Design an enzyme around this catalytic site. Structure first.
Site, short mmCIF file in Angstrom:
data_model
loop_
_atom_site.label_atom_id
_atom_site.label_comp_id
_atom_site.label_asym_id
_atom_site.label_seq_id
_atom_site.Cartn_x
_atom_site.Cartn_y
_atom_site.Cartn_z
N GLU A 36 0.81 -1.21 0.00
CA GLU A 36 0.00 0.00 0.00
C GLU A 36 0.85 1.28 0.00
O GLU A 36 0.58 2.24 -0.76
CB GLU A 36 -0.94 0.02 1.21
CG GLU A 36 -1.83 1.27 1.33
CD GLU A 36 -2.70 1.55 0.11
OE1 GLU A 36 -2.73 2.74 -0.32
OE2 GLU A 36 -3.37 0.59 -0.36
N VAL A 91 -6.69 10.88 6.78
CA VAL A 91 -8.07 10.88 6.32
C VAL A 91 -8.37 9.59 5.57
O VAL A 91 -7.71 9.27 4.61
CB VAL A 91 -8.33 12.11 5.40
CG1 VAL A 91 -9.69 12.06 4.70
CG2 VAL A 91 -8.18 13.36 6.24
N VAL A 97 -10.12 5.10 0.04
CA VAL A 97 -9.28 4.61 1.14
C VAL A 97 -7.86 4.34 0.65
O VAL A 97 -7.69 3.64 -0.34
CB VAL A 97 -9.85 3.33 1.78
CG1 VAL A 97 -8.88 2.75 2.79
CG2 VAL A 97 -11.20 3.62 2.44
N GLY A 98 -6.86 4.85 1.36
CA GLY A 98 -5.45 4.76 0.94
C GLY A 98 -4.48 4.56 2.10
O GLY A 98 -4.62 3.61 2.91
#
Ligand code: E0L
Length: 198
Positions: A36, A91, A97-98
């Site tokens: 990721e 955030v 979504v990250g």
């Protein structure tokens, strides 16, 4: 309040790491943490600004990812009262979504940004910033460095990064993203590799 949202999102990730990172017992989610962070650096490559990425397995079983891109914007975001980099690190918005997922699941995370002649640094603990991003020094380089120490509350059983797992995916990613140059170095035994496909 953005602050309220931020903590809800972090808490959402801790409670349900399966839907964000993968299985937390068998190694897959642990290594997905690395991939990721790496995927963010590749985005900076695909965007035309980064050309080298270095992935390091440290001997204290953290992993760092360094890119030579622009460096995450440091300007106090026009919208939320903290640096744009903190926003990106914290955030949640699975839509949008990250890298907040990794921050949430790390007992510690270090962020170092080199840009506009300045070195900026921030430390996070379980996704929570110890202080606002701050200038610690000067430089002529640019880029973003994220190092993370995965939570051993979250991950069981397979808790150590495997060179070969990381080598295999990094090789695949350079293959799929022809032109990106990726270095992998193991600090535990001095092993390293360089993956580029052209
Ligand atoms: C190891 N590397 C990295 C890890 C984790 C996150 C990022 C995010 C970034 C980025 O967000 N870069 C960027 C730079 C300049 C401008 C903008 C913008 O969107 O306006 C974005 C990057 O370059 N590396 C990253």
């Amino acid at each position: 309040s953005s602050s309220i949202k931020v903590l809800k999102g972090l808490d959402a990730v801790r409670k349900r790491p399966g839907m964000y990172i993968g299985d937390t017992d068998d190694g897959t989610g642990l290594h997905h943490m690395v991939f990721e962070v790496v995927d963010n650096a590749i985005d900076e490559a695909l965007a035309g600004h980064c050309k080298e990425i270095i992935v390091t397995i440290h001997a204290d079983n953290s992993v760092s990812v360094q890119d030579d891109g622009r460096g995450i914007p440091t300007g106090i975001h026009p919208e939320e009262g903290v640096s744009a980099a903190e926003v990106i690190m914290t955030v949640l918005h699975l839509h949008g979504v990250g890298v907040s997922v990794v921050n949430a699941l790390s007992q510690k995370l270090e962020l170092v940004i080199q840009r506009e002649g300045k070195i900026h640094r921030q430390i996070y603990e379980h996704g929570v910033p110890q202080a606002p991003l701050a200038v610690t020094g000067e430089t002529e380089k640019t880029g973003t460095m994220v190092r993370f120490w995965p939570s051993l509350e979250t991950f069981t059983n397979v808790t150590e990064f495997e060179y070969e797992i990381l080598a295999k995916r990094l090789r695949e990613l350079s293959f799929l993203n022809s032109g990106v140059s990726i270095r992998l170095r193991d600090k535990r035994d001095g092993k390293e590799d360089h993956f580029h496909y052209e």
